[PDB]
PDB file of C-alpha atoms in Angstrom:
ATOM      1  CA  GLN A   1       0.034   0.063   0.068  1.00 12.25           C
ATOM      2  CA  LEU A   2       2.702   2.494   1.098  1.00 12.30           C
ATOM      3  CA  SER A   3       4.916   1.619  -1.961  1.00 13.08           C
ATOM      4  CA  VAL A   4       2.087   2.098  -4.334  1.00 16.21           C
ATOM      5  CA  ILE A   5       1.512   5.491  -2.728  1.00 17.15           C
ATOM      6  CA  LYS A   6       5.126   6.491  -2.879  1.00 19.91           C
ATOM      7  CA  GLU A   7       5.263   5.500  -6.497  1.00 19.83           C
ATOM      8  CA  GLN A   8       1.962   7.447  -7.379  1.00 15.24           C
ATOM      9  CA  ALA A   9       3.441  10.553  -5.593  1.00 15.77           C
ATOM     10  CA  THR A  10       6.720  10.027  -7.444  1.00 15.64           C
ATOM     11  CA  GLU A  11       4.937  10.067 -10.800  1.00 15.79           C
ATOM     12  CA  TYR A  12       2.959  13.205  -9.754  1.00 16.63           C
ATOM     13  CA  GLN A  13       6.196  14.888  -8.563  1.00 16.78           C
ATOM     14  CA  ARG A  14       7.461  14.351 -12.194  1.00 15.69           C
ATOM     15  CA  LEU A  15       4.189  15.693 -13.567  1.00 14.39           C
ATOM     16  CA  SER A  16       4.410  18.698 -11.404  1.00 14.32           C
ATOM     17  CA  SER A  17       8.024  19.432 -12.470  1.00  8.95           C
ATOM     18  CA  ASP A  18       6.954  19.022 -16.078  1.00  8.99           C
ATOM     19  CA  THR A  19       4.081  21.256 -15.526  1.00  9.38           C
ATOM     20  CA  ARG A  20       6.297  24.044 -14.061  1.00  6.68           C
ATOM     21  CA  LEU A  21       8.653  23.648 -17.034  1.00  8.46           C
ATOM     22  CA  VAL A  22       5.701  24.308 -19.417  1.00  8.28           C
ATOM     23  CA  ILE A  23       5.098  27.395 -17.209  1.00  8.59           C
ATOM     24  CA  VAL A  24       8.630  28.627 -17.894  1.00  7.02           C
ATOM     25  CA  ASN A  25       7.764  28.797 -21.593  1.00  9.44           C
ATOM     26  CA  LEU A  26       4.643  30.529 -20.758  1.00  8.68           C
ATOM     27  CA  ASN A  27       6.399  33.152 -18.591  1.00  6.09           C
ATOM     28  CA  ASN A  28       8.943  33.669 -21.261  1.00  4.48           C
ATOM     29  CA  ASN A  29       6.229  34.055 -23.926  1.00  2.55           C
ATOM     30  CA  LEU A  30       4.428  36.731 -21.704  1.00  3.32           C
ATOM     31  CA  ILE A  31       7.728  38.337 -20.961  1.00  2.78           C
ATOM     32  CA  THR A  32       8.630  38.525 -24.614  1.00  2.85           C
ATOM     33  CA  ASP A  33       5.253  40.060 -25.604  1.00  9.48           C
ATOM     34  CA  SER A  34       5.518  42.591 -22.886  1.00  5.89           C
ATOM     35  CA  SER A  35       9.050  43.712 -23.963  1.00  6.15           C
ATOM     36  CA  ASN A  36       7.967  43.876 -27.580  1.00  4.50           C
ATOM     37  CA  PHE A  37       4.997  46.174 -26.494  1.00  2.00           C
ATOM     38  CA  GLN A  38       7.182  48.418 -24.296  1.00  2.00           C
ATOM     39  CA  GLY A  39       9.547  48.839 -27.319  1.00  2.00           C
ATOM     40  CA  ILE A  40       6.494  49.512 -29.494  1.00  2.00           C
ATOM     41  CA  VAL A  41       5.470  52.268 -27.154  1.00  2.00           C
ATOM     42  CA  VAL A  42       8.910  53.675 -26.572  1.00  2.00           C
ATOM     43  CA  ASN A  43       9.637  54.205 -30.332  1.00  2.00           C
ATOM     44  CA  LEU A  44       6.156  55.641 -31.093  1.00  2.00           C
ATOM     45  CA  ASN A  45       6.963  58.235 -28.374  1.00  2.00           C
ATOM     46  CA  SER A  46      10.361  59.063 -29.971  1.00  2.00           C
ATOM     47  CA  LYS A  47       8.364  59.607 -33.310  1.00  2.00           C
ATOM     48  CA  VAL A  48       5.710  61.799 -31.567  1.00  2.00           C
ATOM     49  CA  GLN A  49       8.391  63.872 -29.692  1.00  2.00           C
ATOM     50  CA  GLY A  50      10.383  64.497 -32.895  1.00  2.00           C
ATOM     51  CA  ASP A  51       7.040  65.434 -34.689  1.00  2.00           C
ATOM     52  CA  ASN A  52       6.266  67.860 -31.937  1.00  2.00           C
ATOM     53  CA  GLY A  53       9.601  69.581 -32.513  1.00  2.00           C
TER      54      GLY A  53
ATOM     55  CA  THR B   1      -7.417  38.395  45.038  1.00  3.74           C
ATOM     56  CA  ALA B   2      -5.895  41.665  43.730  1.00  2.03           C
ATOM     57  CA  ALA B   3      -3.057  39.539  42.339  1.00  2.06           C
ATOM     58  CA  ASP B   4      -5.577  37.154  40.592  1.00  3.31           C
ATOM     59  CA  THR B   5      -7.062  40.297  38.916  1.00  3.35           C
ATOM     60  CA  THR B   6      -3.530  41.609  37.954  1.00  2.38           C
ATOM     61  CA  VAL B   7      -2.654  38.267  36.124  1.00  2.26           C
ATOM     62  CA  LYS B   8      -5.937  38.732  34.192  1.00  2.00           C
ATOM     63  CA  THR B   9      -4.546  42.311  33.295  1.00  2.14           C
ATOM     64  CA  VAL B  10      -1.099  40.874  32.593  1.00  2.00           C
ATOM     65  CA  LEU B  11      -2.805  38.403  29.922  1.00  2.00           C
ATOM     66  CA  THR B  12      -4.472  41.426  28.415  1.00  2.00           C
ATOM     67  CA  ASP B  13      -1.129  43.125  28.000  1.00  2.00           C
ATOM     68  CA  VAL B  14       0.283  40.079  26.427  1.00  2.00           C
ATOM     69  CA  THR B  15      -2.507  39.559  23.834  1.00  2.00           C
ATOM     70  CA  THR B  16      -1.899  43.340  23.001  1.00  2.00           C
ATOM     71  CA  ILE B  17       1.742  42.760  22.389  1.00  2.00           C
ATOM     72  CA  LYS B  18       0.947  39.540  20.384  1.00  2.70           C
ATOM     73  CA  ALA B  19      -1.417  41.679  18.245  1.00  5.46           C
ATOM     74  CA  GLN B  20       1.511  44.268  17.677  1.00  8.18           C
ATOM     75  CA  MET B  21       3.921  41.485  16.477  1.00  5.96           C
ATOM     76  CA  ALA B  22       1.823  39.323  14.159  1.00  4.54           C
ATOM     77  CA  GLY B  23       1.825  39.119  10.387  1.00  3.80           C
ATOM     78  CA  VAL B  24       4.236  39.084   7.412  1.00  2.00           C
ATOM     79  CA  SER B  25       3.956  42.353   5.524  1.00  2.00           C
ATOM     80  CA  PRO B  26       3.351  41.650   1.787  1.00  3.11           C
ATOM     81  CA  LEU B  27       5.351  42.731  -1.160  1.00  2.00           C
ATOM     82  CA  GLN B  28       4.795  46.503  -2.158  1.00  2.00           C
ATOM     83  CA  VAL B  29       5.367  47.090  -5.821  1.00  2.00           C
ATOM     84  CA  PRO B  30       6.622  50.808  -6.176  1.00  2.00           C
ATOM     85  CA  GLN B  31       5.769  52.969  -9.308  1.00  2.00           C
ATOM     86  CA  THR B  32       9.096  54.095 -10.985  1.00  2.00           C
ATOM     87  CA  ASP B  33       8.850  55.871 -14.440  1.00  2.00           C
ATOM     88  CA  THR B  34       8.906  54.124 -17.953  1.00  2.00           C
ATOM     89  CA  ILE B  35      10.897  55.805 -20.765  1.00  2.00           C
ATOM     90  CA  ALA B  36       7.759  57.381 -22.469  1.00  2.00           C
ATOM     91  CA  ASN B  37       6.945  59.308 -19.059  1.00  2.00           C
ATOM     92  CA  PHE B  38      10.641  60.452 -18.288  1.00  2.00           C
ATOM     93  CA  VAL B  39      11.054  62.055 -21.773  1.00  2.00           C
ATOM     94  CA  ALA B  40       7.680  63.892 -21.334  1.00  2.00           C
ATOM     95  CA  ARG B  41       8.209  65.509 -17.869  1.00  2.00           C
ATOM     96  CA  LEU B  42      11.627  66.605 -19.286  1.00  2.00           C
ATOM     97  CA  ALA B  43      10.019  67.840 -22.614  1.00  2.00           C
ATOM     98  CA  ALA B  44       7.782  69.604 -20.036  1.00  2.00           C
ATOM     99  CA  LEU B  45      10.330  71.770 -18.136  1.00  2.00           C
ATOM    100  CA  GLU B  46      12.143  72.735 -21.342  1.00  2.00           C
ATOM    101  CA  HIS B  47       9.313  73.844 -23.709  1.00  2.00           C
ATOM    102  CA  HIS B  48       7.735  75.624 -20.814  1.00  2.00           C
TER     103      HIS B  48
ATOM    104  CA  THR C   1      13.470  26.526  23.063  1.00  2.00           C
ATOM    105  CA  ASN C   2      10.898  29.242  21.743  1.00  2.00           C
ATOM    106  CA  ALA C   3      13.946  31.343  20.534  1.00  2.00           C
ATOM    107  CA  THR C   4      14.892  28.391  18.140  1.00  2.00           C
ATOM    108  CA  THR C   5      11.450  28.063  16.841  1.00  2.00           C
ATOM    109  CA  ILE C   6      11.048  31.844  16.383  1.00  2.00           C
ATOM    110  CA  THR C   7      14.647  32.048  14.924  1.00  2.00           C
ATOM    111  CA  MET C   8      13.420  29.546  12.266  1.00  2.00           C
ATOM    112  CA  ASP C   9      10.200  31.472  11.670  1.00  2.00           C
ATOM    113  CA  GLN C  10      11.908  34.739  11.258  1.00  2.00           C
ATOM    114  CA  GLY C  11      14.723  33.222   9.052  1.00  2.00           C
ATOM    115  CA  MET C  12      12.073  31.752   6.744  1.00  2.00           C
ATOM    116  CA  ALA C  13       9.801  34.970   6.859  1.00  2.00           C
ATOM    117  CA  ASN C  14      12.769  37.098   5.946  1.00  2.00           C
ATOM    118  CA  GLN C  15      13.998  34.950   3.042  1.00  2.00           C
ATOM    119  CA  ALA C  16      10.540  34.577   1.588  1.00  2.00           C
ATOM    120  CA  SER C  17       9.718  38.179   1.607  1.00  2.00           C
ATOM    121  CA  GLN C  18      13.084  39.087  -0.059  1.00  2.00           C
ATOM    122  CA  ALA C  19      12.476  36.247  -2.610  1.00  2.00           C
ATOM    123  CA  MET C  20       9.254  38.002  -3.804  1.00  2.00           C
ATOM    124  CA  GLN C  21      11.263  41.222  -3.954  1.00  2.00           C
ATOM    125  CA  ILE C  22      13.900  39.696  -6.141  1.00  2.00           C
ATOM    126  CA  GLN C  23      11.560  37.602  -8.112  1.00  2.00           C
ATOM    127  CA  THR C  24       9.570  40.694  -9.046  1.00  2.00           C
ATOM    128  CA  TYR C  25      12.644  42.625  -9.984  1.00  2.00           C
ATOM    129  CA  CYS C  26      13.907  39.685 -12.205  1.00  2.00           C
ATOM    130  CA  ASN C  27      10.650  39.686 -14.048  1.00  2.00           C
ATOM    131  CA  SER C  28      11.148  43.369 -14.671  1.00  2.00           C
ATOM    132  CA  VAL C  29      14.820  43.043 -15.844  1.00  2.00           C
ATOM    133  CA  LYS C  30      13.656  40.301 -18.277  1.00  2.00           C
ATOM    134  CA  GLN C  31      10.992  42.712 -19.868  1.00  2.00           C
ATOM    135  CA  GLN C  32      13.722  45.411 -20.388  1.00  2.00           C
ATOM    136  CA  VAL C  33      14.032  46.411 -24.032  1.00  2.00           C
ATOM    137  CA  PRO C  34      17.341  46.479 -25.947  1.00  2.00           C
ATOM    138  CA  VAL C  35      18.881  49.605 -27.611  1.00  2.00           C
ATOM    139  CA  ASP C  36      18.958  50.534 -31.344  1.00  2.00           C
ATOM    140  CA  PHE C  37      21.623  52.841 -32.679  1.00  2.00           C
ATOM    141  CA  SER C  38      21.490  51.610 -36.182  1.00  2.00           C
ATOM    142  CA  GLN C  39      21.048  55.281 -37.356  1.00  2.00           C
ATOM    143  CA  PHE C  40      24.495  56.292 -36.016  1.00  2.00           C
ATOM    144  CA  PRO C  41      27.492  54.378 -37.435  1.00  2.00           C
ATOM    145  CA  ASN C  42      29.693  56.031 -34.821  1.00  2.00           C
ATOM    146  CA  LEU C  43      27.744  53.969 -32.183  1.00  2.00           C
ATOM    147  CA  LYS C  44      27.334  50.383 -33.857  1.00  2.00           C
ATOM    148  CA  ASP C  45      29.899  49.078 -31.353  1.00  2.00           C
ATOM    149  CA  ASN C  46      28.151  50.539 -28.255  1.00  2.00           C
ATOM    150  CA  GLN C  47      24.935  48.852 -29.296  1.00  2.00           C
ATOM    151  CA  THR C  48      26.336  45.369 -29.452  1.00  2.00           C
ATOM    152  CA  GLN C  49      28.090  45.966 -25.962  1.00  2.00           C
ATOM    153  CA  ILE C  50      24.993  47.505 -24.327  1.00  2.00           C
ATOM    154  CA  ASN C  51      22.762  44.645 -25.661  1.00  2.00           C
ATOM    155  CA  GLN C  52      25.270  41.933 -24.661  1.00  2.00           C
TER     156      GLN C  52
ATOM    157  CA  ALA D   1      -1.444  46.371   9.345  1.00  2.00           C
ATOM    158  CA  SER D   2       0.192  45.514  12.759  1.00  2.00           C
ATOM    159  CA  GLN D   3       2.994  47.531  14.195  1.00  2.00           C
ATOM    160  CA  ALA D   4       5.747  44.845  13.257  1.00  2.00           C
ATOM    161  CA  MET D   5       4.271  44.854   9.704  1.00  2.00           C
ATOM    162  CA  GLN D   6       4.641  48.673   9.530  1.00  2.00           C
ATOM    163  CA  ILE D   7       8.339  48.264  10.488  1.00  2.00           C
ATOM    164  CA  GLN D   8       8.856  45.512   8.067  1.00  2.00           C
ATOM    165  CA  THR D   9       7.391  47.616   5.275  1.00  2.00           C
ATOM    166  CA  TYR D  10      10.000  50.229   6.112  1.00  2.00           C
ATOM    167  CA  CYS D  11      12.859  47.692   6.282  1.00  2.00           C
ATOM    168  CA  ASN D  12      11.864  45.999   3.041  1.00  2.00           C
ATOM    169  CA  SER D  13      11.514  49.382   1.369  1.00  2.00           C
ATOM    170  CA  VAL D  14      14.821  50.911   2.336  1.00  2.00           C
ATOM    171  CA  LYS D  15      16.933  47.663   1.673  1.00  2.00           C
ATOM    172  CA  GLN D  16      15.918  47.910  -1.948  1.00  2.00           C
ATOM    173  CA  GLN D  17      17.096  51.526  -2.651  1.00  2.00           C
ATOM    174  CA  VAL D  18      20.018  51.883  -4.834  1.00  2.00           C
ATOM    175  CA  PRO D  19      22.844  54.380  -3.967  1.00  2.00           C
ATOM    176  CA  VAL D  20      22.959  57.417  -6.285  1.00  2.00           C
ATOM    177  CA  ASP D  21      25.649  58.375  -8.683  1.00  2.00           C
ATOM    178  CA  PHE D  22      25.506  62.087  -9.358  1.00  2.00           C
ATOM    179  CA  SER D  23      28.916  62.142 -11.035  1.00  2.00           C
ATOM    180  CA  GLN D  24      27.296  63.928 -14.044  1.00  2.00           C
ATOM    181  CA  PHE D  25      26.079  66.630 -11.703  1.00  2.00           C
ATOM    182  CA  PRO D  26      28.752  68.406  -9.659  1.00  2.00           C
ATOM    183  CA  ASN D  27      26.189  70.714  -8.232  1.00  2.00           C
ATOM    184  CA  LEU D  28      24.768  67.602  -6.446  1.00  2.00           C
ATOM    185  CA  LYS D  29      28.373  66.224  -5.304  1.00  2.00           C
ATOM    186  CA  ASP D  30      27.594  66.618  -1.505  1.00  2.00           C
ATOM    187  CA  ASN D  31      23.834  65.404  -1.848  1.00  2.00           C
ATOM    188  CA  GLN D  32      25.386  62.087  -3.253  1.00  2.00           C
ATOM    189  CA  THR D  33      27.601  61.822   0.007  1.00  2.00           C
ATOM    190  CA  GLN D  34      24.525  62.552   2.274  1.00  2.00           C
ATOM    191  CA  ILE D  35      22.162  60.210   0.464  1.00  2.00           C
ATOM    192  CA  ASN D  36      24.564  57.249   0.318  1.00  2.00           C
ATOM    193  CA  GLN D  37      25.693  57.390   4.079  1.00  2.00           C
ATOM    194  CA  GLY D  38      22.220  57.960   5.340  1.00  2.00           C
ATOM    195  CA  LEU D  39      20.967  54.878   3.236  1.00  2.00           C
ATOM    196  CA  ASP D  40      23.916  52.563   4.135  1.00  2.00           C
ATOM    197  CA  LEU D  41      23.122  53.454   7.784  1.00  2.00           C
ATOM    198  CA  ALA D  42      19.471  52.683   7.469  1.00  2.00           C
ATOM    199  CA  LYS D  43      20.174  49.299   5.613  1.00  2.00           C
ATOM    200  CA  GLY D  44      22.167  48.371   8.756  1.00  2.00           C
ATOM    201  CA  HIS D  45      19.351  49.324  11.036  1.00  2.00           C
ATOM    202  CA  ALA D  46      16.810  47.543   8.945  1.00  2.00           C
ATOM    203  CA  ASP D  47      18.803  44.241   8.995  1.00  2.00           C
ATOM    204  CA  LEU D  48      18.957  44.511  12.680  1.00  2.00           C
ATOM    205  CA  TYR D  49      15.285  44.709  13.119  1.00  2.00           C
ATOM    206  CA  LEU D  50      14.775  41.843  10.604  1.00  2.00           C
ATOM    207  CA  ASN D  51      17.472  39.448  11.909  1.00  2.00           C
ATOM    208  CA  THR D  52      17.753  40.499  15.721  1.00  2.00           C
ATOM    209  CA  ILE D  53      15.198  42.835  17.273  1.00  2.00           C
ATOM    210  CA  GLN D  54      11.752  41.577  15.963  1.00  2.00           C
ATOM    211  CA  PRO D  55      12.848  37.909  16.752  1.00  2.00           C
ATOM    212  CA  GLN D  56      13.901  38.779  20.282  1.00  2.00           C
ATOM    213  CA  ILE D  57      10.635  40.711  20.832  1.00  2.00           C
ATOM    214  CA  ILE D  58       8.548  37.763  19.562  1.00  2.00           C
ATOM    215  CA  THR D  59      10.650  35.288  21.565  1.00  2.00           C
ATOM    216  CA  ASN D  60      10.390  37.283  24.839  1.00  2.00           C
ATOM    217  CA  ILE D  61       6.618  37.471  24.564  1.00  2.00           C
ATOM    218  CA  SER D  62       6.342  33.706  23.761  1.00  2.00           C
ATOM    219  CA  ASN D  63       8.037  32.807  27.055  1.00  2.00           C
ATOM    220  CA  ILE D  64       6.032  35.474  29.032  1.00  2.00           C
ATOM    221  CA  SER D  65       2.637  34.268  27.289  1.00  2.00           C
ATOM    222  CA  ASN D  66       3.508  30.505  27.829  1.00  2.00           C
ATOM    223  CA  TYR D  67       3.854  30.889  31.556  1.00  2.00           C
ATOM    224  CA  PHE D  68       0.770  32.926  32.217  1.00  2.00           C
ATOM    225  CA  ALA D  69      -1.315  30.888  29.791  1.00  2.00           C
ATOM    226  CA  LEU D  70      -0.803  27.979  32.345  1.00  2.00           C
ATOM    227  CA  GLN D  71      -0.506  30.324  35.496  1.00  2.00           C
ATOM    228  CA  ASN D  72      -3.694  32.217  34.422  1.00  2.00           C
ATOM    229  CA  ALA D  73      -4.857  32.701  37.996  1.00  2.00           C
ATOM    230  CA  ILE D  74      -3.669  33.189  41.503  1.00  2.00           C
ATOM    231  CA  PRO D  75      -4.989  30.820  44.299  1.00  2.00           C
ATOM    232  CA  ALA D  76      -6.251  33.471  46.789  1.00  2.00           C
ATOM    233  CA  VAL D  77      -7.447  30.693  49.254  1.00  2.00           C
ATOM    234  CA  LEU D  78      -5.676  27.418  50.321  1.00  2.00           C
ATOM    235  CA  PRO D  79      -6.337  25.040  47.524  1.00  2.00           C
ATOM    236  CA  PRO D  80      -7.986  21.671  48.304  1.00  2.00           C
ATOM    237  CA  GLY D  81      -5.184  19.087  49.292  1.00  2.00           C
ATOM    238  CA  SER D  82      -2.303  21.607  50.018  1.00  2.00           C
ATOM    239  CA  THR D  83      -0.755  22.687  53.273  1.00  2.00           C
ATOM    240  CA  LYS D  84      -0.231  26.284  54.309  1.00  2.00           C
ATOM    241  CA  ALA D  85       3.605  25.699  53.917  1.00  2.00           C
ATOM    242  CA  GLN D  86       3.326  24.447  50.396  1.00  2.00           C
ATOM    243  CA  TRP D  87       0.640  27.035  49.274  1.00  2.00           C
ATOM    244  CA  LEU D  88       3.155  29.808  50.235  1.00  2.00           C
ATOM    245  CA  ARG D  89       5.819  28.105  48.305  1.00  2.00           C
TER     246      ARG D  89
ATOM    247  CA  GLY E   1      -3.364  51.051 -27.028  1.00  2.00           C
ATOM    248  CA  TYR E   2       0.000  49.163 -26.775  1.00  2.00           C
ATOM    249  CA  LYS E   3       0.681  50.636 -23.315  1.00  2.00           C
ATOM    250  CA  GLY E   4      -2.697  48.972 -22.529  1.00  2.00           C
ATOM    251  CA  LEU E   5      -1.628  45.557 -23.935  1.00  2.00           C
ATOM    252  CA  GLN E   6       1.833  45.875 -22.128  1.00  2.00           C
ATOM    253  CA  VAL E   7      -0.033  46.452 -18.714  1.00  2.00           C
ATOM    254  CA  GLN E   8      -2.178  43.360 -19.503  1.00  2.00           C
ATOM    255  CA  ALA E   9       0.841  41.280 -20.507  1.00  2.00           C
ATOM    256  CA  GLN E  10       2.793  42.427 -17.267  1.00  2.00           C
ATOM    257  CA  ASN E  11      -0.227  41.291 -15.272  1.00  2.00           C
ATOM    258  CA  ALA E  12      -0.288  37.934 -17.133  1.00  2.00           C
ATOM    259  CA  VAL E  13       3.443  37.592 -16.233  1.00  2.00           C
ATOM    260  CA  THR E  14       2.874  38.057 -12.498  1.00  2.00           C
ATOM    261  CA  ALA E  15      -0.069  35.689 -12.845  1.00  2.00           C
ATOM    262  CA  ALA E  16       2.229  33.097 -14.590  1.00  2.00           C
ATOM    263  CA  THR E  17       5.059  33.708 -11.959  1.00  2.00           C
ATOM    264  CA  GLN E  18       2.442  32.888  -9.199  1.00  2.00           C
ATOM    265  CA  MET E  19       1.540  29.747 -11.067  1.00  2.00           C
ATOM    266  CA  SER E  20       5.289  28.765 -11.136  1.00  2.00           C
ATOM    267  CA  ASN E  21       5.485  29.398  -7.336  1.00  2.00           C
ATOM    268  CA  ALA E  22       2.386  27.193  -6.634  1.00  2.00           C
ATOM    269  CA  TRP E  23       3.652  24.375  -8.742  1.00  2.00           C
ATOM    270  CA  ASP E  24       7.052  24.535  -7.133  1.00  2.00           C
ATOM    271  CA  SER E  25       5.349  24.320  -3.876  1.00  2.00           C
ATOM    272  CA  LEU E  26       3.533  21.105  -4.934  1.00  2.00           C
ATOM    273  CA  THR E  27       6.750  19.533  -6.365  1.00  2.00           C
ATOM    274  CA  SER E  28       8.659  20.189  -3.153  1.00  2.00           C
ATOM    275  CA  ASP E  29       5.813  19.024  -0.815  1.00  2.00           C
ATOM    276  CA  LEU E  30       5.505  15.785  -2.860  1.00  2.00           C
ATOM    277  CA  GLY E  31       9.307  15.623  -2.336  1.00  2.00           C
ATOM    278  CA  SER E  32       8.778  15.665   1.452  1.00  2.00           C
ATOM    279  CA  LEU E  33       6.021  13.003   1.137  1.00  2.00           C
ATOM    280  CA  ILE E  34       8.254  10.635  -0.958  1.00  2.00           C
ATOM    281  CA  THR E  35      11.105  10.965   1.530  1.00  2.00           C
ATOM    282  CA  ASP E  36       8.665  10.202   4.482  1.00  2.00           C
ATOM    283  CA  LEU E  37       7.084   7.334   2.801  1.00  2.00           C
ATOM    284  CA  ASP E  38      10.525   6.029   1.790  1.00  2.00           C
ATOM    285  CA  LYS E  39      11.873   6.401   5.303  1.00  2.00           C
ATOM    286  CA  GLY E  40       8.752   4.955   6.842  1.00  2.00           C
ATOM    287  CA  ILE E  41       8.866   1.921   4.624  1.00  2.00           C
ATOM    288  CA  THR E  42      12.565   1.119   5.209  1.00  2.00           C
ATOM    289  CA  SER E  43      12.164   1.797   9.062  1.00  2.00           C
ATOM    290  CA  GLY E  44      10.274  -0.087  11.903  1.00  2.00           C
ATOM    291  CA  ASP E  45       8.472   0.193  15.220  1.00  2.00           C
ATOM    292  CA  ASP E  46       8.310   3.842  16.467  1.00  2.00           C
ATOM    293  CA  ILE E  47      10.492   5.136  13.856  1.00  2.00           C
ATOM    294  CA  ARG E  48       8.415   3.966  10.894  1.00  2.00           C
ATOM    295  CA  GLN E  49       5.561   5.537  12.758  1.00  2.00           C
ATOM    296  CA  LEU E  50       7.262   8.831  13.032  1.00  2.00           C
ATOM    297  CA  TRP E  51       8.032   9.059   9.379  1.00  2.00           C
ATOM    298  CA  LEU E  52       4.550   8.061   8.308  1.00  2.00           C
TER     299      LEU E  52
END
């Protein structure tokens, strides 16, 4: 009984680690999109500031 | 008897101190400037 | 010894609170955008250095 | 927000500040000195609260609390089964 | 508009970072459970009972 439980738990620990690894790609995707948008905004501002001149 | 009453008071004082000392203050996220906003406030002092 | 338990509590409490501080800062450093000086030949080399 | 949480906020806030470089502004030369010492000194103070004082304060009230939780009253009359001698003790 | 999408995306990032934290907590706690079952199985008497 206890060995069957320790094995199930071992499988789920692996599943949890895989899951977290999927979540690094997710975080990195969101981080990229955010960085991209910041840059979008920053350069549009440079264009507007030059035009106001 | 006065002693017994004072102990009661002493426990009062202790739960007071316990209330002072509890909790884990959470993260505070400040608000520093982005580049769009720094260039503006600067463009602000210079053209007026 | 209460001192020992409390020492463990406070140790943990401090490290977790700082972890949330550094974790948030690291997220913000990763969203930081690179420079572009491709309009100024003079400055090609500082771009590649900055961005590296 | 408890009193300890108020102090933690302060400690957590100050420990994250970044010393200034005003090297581009000689007008602010001395301001750079004042800021950077005042800060360094407060970082020291903050650490002290976080790793020494707050734990002492909590520790001390635990021991106090723990006793009087159990001795939560004073026998004003000779308890059943005791002697005078051993009640006074 | 893209200042709006950036704020949404920053939020998403925090949200995803909190997902990472939670899943880490699960991984680690399963870690403790595996240890404890392991030690309980390979122990006896009162010590097996402690671990379990």
